Amino acid sequence: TRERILHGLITLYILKELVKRPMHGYELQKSMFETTGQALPQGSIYILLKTMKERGFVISESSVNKGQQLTVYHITDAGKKFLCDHSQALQLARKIIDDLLSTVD
């Protein structure tokens, strides 16, 4: 998440998931894992979400249960626009990545 291209892509993935329905962080973390076979480090999902909230892409809503915080994330209309805008050149991206991949262990 600490690399720009990846940070961008993960943002998009989140956004796309949230279009489906609002989600907890743990759900986003799990789906991503299941989709790609790769797990984000503990707590890292929430840092990205924080950023997205700051950016205006997501709104959070928190409950408290033992006095623990249960937060669900919601995509904004702006977040939907960003997703839309930034998903237009994904085919080209994939082609480029493939090429690059042929050069990397």
Alpha carbon distance 91, 12 (integer Å):
14
Tell whether residue 5 is a contact of its own copies (CB under 8 A).
Answer: yes
For residues 8 to 47, the per-residue mask of contacts with Cl ion, x marking binding by CB under 5 A and - elsewhere, is ----------------xxx---------------------
Query: Which residue type occupies 65?
Result: N
Residues 36-65 that bind its own copies (CB under 8 A): 36, 38, 42-43, 46, 63-65
| CA dist., res. 82 & res. 19, Å (int) | 12
Binding to its own copies by residue 21, rule CB under 8 A? yes
- Residues after which the chain has a gap (C–N > 2.5 Å): 65
Min dist. Cβ of residue 22 to Cl ion (A): 12
